[PDB]
Here is the input.
Amino acid sequence: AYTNSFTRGVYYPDKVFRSSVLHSTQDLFLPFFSNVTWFHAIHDNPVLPFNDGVYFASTEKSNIIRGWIFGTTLDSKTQSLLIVNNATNVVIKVCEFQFCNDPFLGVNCTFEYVSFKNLREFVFKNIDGYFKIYSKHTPINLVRDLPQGFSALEPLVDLPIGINITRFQTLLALHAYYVGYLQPRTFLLKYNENGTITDAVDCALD
Amino acid sequence: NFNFNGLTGTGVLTESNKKFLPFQQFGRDIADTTDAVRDPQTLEILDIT
Ligand SMILES: *[C@@H]1O[C@H](CO)[C@@H](O[C@@H]2O[C@H](CO)[C@@H](O)[C@H](O)[C@H]2NC(C)=O)[C@H](O)[C@H]1NC(C)=O
Ligand SMILES: *[C@@H]1O[C@H](CO)[C@@H](O)[C@H](O)[C@H]1NC(C)=O
Ligand SMILES: *[C@@H]1O[C@H](CO)[C@@H](O)[C@H](O)[C@H]1NC(C)=O
Ligand SMILES: *[C@@H]1O[C@H](CO)[C@@H](O)[C@H](O)[C@H]1NC(C)=O
Ligand SMILES: *[C@@H]1O[C@H](CO)[C@@H](O)[C@H](O)[C@H]1NC(C)=O
Ligand SMILES: *[C@@H]1O[C@H](CO)[C@@H](O)[C@H](O)[C@H]1NC(C)=O
Here is the structure.
């Protein structure tokens, strides 16, 4: 299934502060009004590709999704990144750790790091040797679709991993999300007086 | 003369009222000059004039 992304998916492009200014920047963004593939939870684990970057949004309260896997040959024979909500803390590990082809739990490693009324958005991108994570958490009432609205993402973590990626998978557990790819675009962001991006223009749109 | 992490220049430092997000290190002006910098050894945020 598919559904348009209205405008959300924009993130603070750099680590620099700006206020009350219209700033133009070229970067990997999710173009406005592009379809984003829609998935729902039952039983299976659908496959997804990965190029340039990805924007990944979800809505849930039972922690149905615990994390993610990223890599090229995911079946435990090359270096791959695993993100998981440990129990309350979030852990990231780059290793060739053993997986099934559709892993889920019940109720040579190289890198380690530790940390439906709500909707959580993320952006993952591998550029300049770094793996960069951006996120936003927001209360919502539209359990069905990512709402018509706007809010910028800010980085959660910025790792110097530098591995190759062509695929990724979501991770669940045994006891409703959207994914869309980024493209290089030139954007115009309006930084308000307090320094927060309040609106943006994807001016390759029309 | 001020030097924060190699960002070097001359100016008068003052306490800043800008609300930097936790991942931001300096504020860049319209002329592409740093008008605000975080003290590397503190949470303090200082304005350059
Ligand atoms: C990352 O690894 C994948 C393989 O997992 C590489 O895929 C190759 O891409 C080239 C592009 O021209 C193809 O010709 C090859 O046939 C692909 N190989 C396979 C096995 O699919 C990819 O090139 C790698 N990229 C980086 C940046 O390391
Ligand atoms: C994606 O969106 C375009 C218009 O934005 C539409 O023409 C196309 O059919 C959509 N893709 C699918 C698979 O429906
Ligand atoms: C959290 O992580 C630590 C270290 O990896 C582990 O010992 C602990 O068991 C984890 N939490 C739970 C509830 O298992
Ligand atoms: C990975 O583990 C295997 C043993 O299963 C070992 O032979 C190999 O040297 C290790 N490192 C790499 C890069 O394969
Ligand atoms: C800006 O931040 C101040 C903090 O005191 C707050 O009172 C004000 O409402 C904020 N305004 C906007 C537009 O974010
Ligand atoms: C570094 O500076 C901080 C002040 O922010 C101080 O508390 C800390 O003790 C200093 N480092 C060491 C090793 O003392």
User: Anything to note?
Assistant: Residues A 86-87 surround 2-acetamido-2-deoxy-beta-D-glucopyranose (ligand 3) (CB under 6 Å). The radius of gyration of chain A is 17 Å. The first strand of chain A starts at residue 2 and ends at 4.
